[PDB]
């Protein structure tokens, strides 16, 4: 669970990603927007990205995809893009922020 940073805020995540991260580095943190949920924060060129993960009945929901555990979700997005740009750029989770 090297990627789980706990209750770090969105701002703290932005700073940490920019100070210590390279593109593809990411963290999972508690959501500041809803109590039992999470955010995936990803270092990306120009502007970092934040994705919602909603925990419902022990299932981790992101977009229209569902995962048994946060680990499964994270591993999925190392192998399938978590974001795709208009110019064909596919962004993947690569590594927990160090």
């Amino acid at each position: 669970s090297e990627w789980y940073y706990g209750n770090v805020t969105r701002h703290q995540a932005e700073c940490a990603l920019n100070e210590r991260g390279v593109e593809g580095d990411f963290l999972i943190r508690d959501s500041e927007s809803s109590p039992s949920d999470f955010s995936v924060s990803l270092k990306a060129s120009g502007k970092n990205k934040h994705f919602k993960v909603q925990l419902v009945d022990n299932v981790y929901c992101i977009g229209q995809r569902r995962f048994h555990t946060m680990d499964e979700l994270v591993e999925h997005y190392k192998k399938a893009p978590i974001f795709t740009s208009e110019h064909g750029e596919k962004l993947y989770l690569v590594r927990a922020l160090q």
Binding site: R10, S33, F51, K52, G63, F83
Partner: peptide, 8 residues
């Protein structure tokens, strides 16, 4: 806070 759209 605004969140980014996850890729399908």
């Amino acid at each position: 806070h605004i969140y980014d759209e996850v890729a399908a």
